[PDB]
Design an enzyme around this catalytic site. Sequence first.
Site, PDB file in Angstrom:
ATOM      1  N   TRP A 101      24.362  37.031  39.633  1.00 16.30           N
ATOM      2  CA  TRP A 101      23.783  36.134  38.634  1.00 16.30           C
ATOM      3  C   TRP A 101      24.775  35.602  37.591  1.00 16.30           C
ATOM      4  O   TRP A 101      25.789  36.233  37.328  1.00 16.30           O
ATOM      5  CB  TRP A 101      22.534  36.738  37.990  1.00 16.30           C
ATOM      6  CG  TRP A 101      22.615  38.195  37.700  1.00 16.30           C
ATOM      7  CD1 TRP A 101      23.739  38.961  37.634  1.00 16.30           C
ATOM      8  CD2 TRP A 101      21.514  39.069  37.426  1.00 16.30           C
ATOM      9  NE1 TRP A 101      23.406  40.263  37.332  1.00 16.30           N
ATOM     10  CE2 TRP A 101      22.045  40.354  37.201  1.00 16.30           C
ATOM     11  CE3 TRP A 101      20.127  38.884  37.341  1.00 16.30           C
ATOM     12  CZ2 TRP A 101      21.243  41.451  36.906  1.00 16.30           C
ATOM     13  CZ3 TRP A 101      19.329  39.976  37.044  1.00 16.30           C
ATOM     14  CH2 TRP A 101      19.889  41.243  36.830  1.00 16.30           C
TER      15      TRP A 101
ATOM     16  N   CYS B 102      29.914  44.340  35.859  1.00 19.66           N
ATOM     17  CA  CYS B 102      30.604  45.120  34.886  1.00 19.66           C
ATOM     18  C   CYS B 102      30.824  44.293  33.660  1.00 19.66           C
ATOM     19  O   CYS B 102      30.674  44.744  32.527  1.00 19.66           O
ATOM     20  CB  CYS B 102      31.882  45.551  35.548  1.00 19.66           C
ATOM     21  SG  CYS B 102      33.408  45.835  34.649  1.00 19.66           S
TER      22      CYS B 102
ATOM     23  N   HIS C 149      38.652  45.223  32.531  1.00 21.47           N
ATOM     24  CA  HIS C 149      37.602  45.754  31.665  1.00 21.47           C
ATOM     25  C   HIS C 149      37.178  44.711  30.607  1.00 21.47           C
ATOM     26  O   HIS C 149      38.022  44.050  29.984  1.00 21.47           O
ATOM     27  CB  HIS C 149      38.045  47.085  31.022  1.00 21.47           C
ATOM     28  CG  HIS C 149      37.056  47.647  30.044  1.00 21.47           C
ATOM     29  ND1 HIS C 149      35.692  47.615  30.256  1.00 21.47           N
ATOM     30  CD2 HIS C 149      37.231  48.241  28.837  1.00 21.47           C
ATOM     31  CE1 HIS C 149      35.071  48.174  29.230  1.00 21.47           C
ATOM     32  NE2 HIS C 149      35.983  48.565  28.356  1.00 21.47           N
TER      33      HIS C 149
ATOM     34  N   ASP D 123      32.427  47.412  22.269  1.00 18.02           N
ATOM     35  CA  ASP D 123      32.313  47.635  23.705  1.00 18.02           C
ATOM     36  C   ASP D 123      30.934  48.107  24.166  1.00 18.02           C
ATOM     37  O   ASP D 123      30.627  49.299  24.083  1.00 18.02           O
ATOM     38  CB  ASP D 123      33.378  48.620  24.182  1.00 18.02           C
ATOM     39  CG  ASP D 123      33.538  48.607  25.690  1.00 18.02           C
ATOM     40  OD1 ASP D 123      32.671  48.029  26.381  1.00 18.02           O
ATOM     41  OD2 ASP D 123      34.533  49.174  26.189  1.00 18.02           O
TER      42      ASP D 123
ATOM     43  N   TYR E  34      61.592  67.387  55.630  1.00 16.08           N
ATOM     44  CA  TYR E  34      62.897  67.177  55.015  1.00 16.08           C
ATOM     45  C   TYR E  34      63.088  65.701  54.667  1.00 16.08           C
ATOM     46  O   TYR E  34      63.820  65.369  53.738  1.00 16.08           O
ATOM     47  CB  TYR E  34      64.025  67.647  55.942  1.00 16.08           C
ATOM     48  CG  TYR E  34      64.349  69.124  55.848  1.00 16.08           C
ATOM     49  CD1 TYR E  34      64.948  69.652  54.713  1.00 16.08           C
ATOM     50  CD2 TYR E  34      64.078  69.986  56.902  1.00 16.08           C
ATOM     51  CE1 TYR E  34      65.252  71.001  54.623  1.00 16.08           C
ATOM     52  CE2 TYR E  34      64.384  71.335  56.820  1.00 16.08           C
ATOM     53  CZ  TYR E  34      64.966  71.834  55.677  1.00 16.08           C
ATOM     54  OH  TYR E  34      65.268  73.173  55.590  1.00 16.08           O
TER      55      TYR E  34
END
Lengths: 611, 4
Positions: free
Chosen positions: A240, A253, A297, A320, A453
């Site tokens: 959306w 997010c 973010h 935030d 090794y």
Amino acid sequence: AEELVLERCDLELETNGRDHHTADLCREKLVVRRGQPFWLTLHFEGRNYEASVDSLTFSVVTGPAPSQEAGTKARFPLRDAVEEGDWTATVVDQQDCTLSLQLTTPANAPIGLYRLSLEASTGYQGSSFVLGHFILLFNAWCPADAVYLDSEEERQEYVLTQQGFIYQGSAKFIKNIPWNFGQFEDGILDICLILLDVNPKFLKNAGRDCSRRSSPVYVGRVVSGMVNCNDDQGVLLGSWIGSVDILRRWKNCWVFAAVACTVLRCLGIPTRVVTNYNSASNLLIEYFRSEMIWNFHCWVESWMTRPDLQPGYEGWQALDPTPCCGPVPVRAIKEGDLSTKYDAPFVFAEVNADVVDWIQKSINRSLIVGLKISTKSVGRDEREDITHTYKYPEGSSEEREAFTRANHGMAMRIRVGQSMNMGSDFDVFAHITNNTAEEYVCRLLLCARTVSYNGILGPECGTKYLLNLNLEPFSEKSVPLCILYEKYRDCLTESNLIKVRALLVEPVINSYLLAERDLYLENPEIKIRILVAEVSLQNPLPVALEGCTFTVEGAGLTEEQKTVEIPDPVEAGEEVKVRMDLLPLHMGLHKLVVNFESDKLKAVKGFRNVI
Amino acid sequence: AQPL
């Protein structure tokens, strides 16, 4: 003289909406902004107002428990004397049957829905009654308002514009998602008010909460904690293209930042969505792949003064709405002044990360947080990079001086202690030293895997995670992880090597310590004693060796290589001895050379000098 | 949005 009768009140939606920049919200009801005069026209039935005969008084209340002391109720007369910064009413036009009034609110009035009442009095008689309702919003146009913004084009962008871009993708492939904030859509302003009215501080103290809505700091803080749903609803719970549908459905997010920005623009707080990019075998990455680190973010910035703080913190405040947080000045983040309210350290950690190698002390640049911090240009369809507002340039004296203000010396190495041997179990240690006056609480990842090794990593043969490791000031710690033969034998390489890796995370400041160290599990030692020479070897395994065989040669001592087998299997810990005859060819130093062979333990070597 |  007969008492006045109001026929009607004209709310002057048009001239008010245009002057108050609320045109779109003034379709039905009156919406205005604080600290700025607005207009009402009274139409009386019969005779008009006569200043000489009539005293008119106004009353406004907002919220469920109004008071004057709280600023959520005011009474004020209609008079010519206008006191700056108060509730006032004054006549500005008088015609046939109409009376034009100009009302003013203080620039620090609580925002919200207001009931406006009028009491008409002719000395000897009186009558009160409701005129109607207006909504009062924040005013980025009013010099005296906390949210004042001295620039017209910025006011357009950060309050008035209903579409923007939210930046996504990655630090190197920045993608700009177009978004519809639609803060001035139908029903939106009513939802923002409802949202305010169901926040925990309202349920706790309605009156006080409605009062505190004078503050853009209080209001922004409340919004950050309401976008998300912490069992108390709560708009979002974790496609959306805007905020309208989300908000409308709610009433019945990057999305968190987007909704927050919608709400705050609606209430009149200039606001912007900002995106921060982060970038990346390595214990860190492993650790990640409850606050983690993502490719990007999103949060918001709102513009306001901060009289609640010390001077100089007005301007952009970070908030935030990601799963209450803020507001905290952006300069306080940039300045490492984390003592500053609200929630400095949390925002600091979104844009800083201190990563240090102990590979034995160096700077590990495999994690890079705080890159291309971004937000839309003012009045143009392009990205503004505001990384500089959060961070001084890397390596500068301001960046370093700031790191100090924030951090107010901790070190980590892998230690072994006693000797480790192919076939035995033994501890390895993360040795942590804390020569600071600070107390810490870290996460700790301690783990081991085999390695060839050549440097190729086999399977894990030991792990110890510690969510909360406490580090007292001026102290050290040796944290053990026990490596088991039972657990590495099967997965061991031709290398004979195990790689120990430790990760210490200090979450608050977001600091990371890596220590890494390869360990060699040495073969048993072959004992060579000359009497004829005797050679023995102790089974280092908790298991028995099948098909043991020695081989001995040494020019100057035997002209023939002597390969002797061992008939019985050698038990755990049980030693195995053989002897062979030697006839010293010449005189000086010779070297005897020995090899031991077995099904589990192969190719172990030894020697001894003679004469 | 993806974990580093």
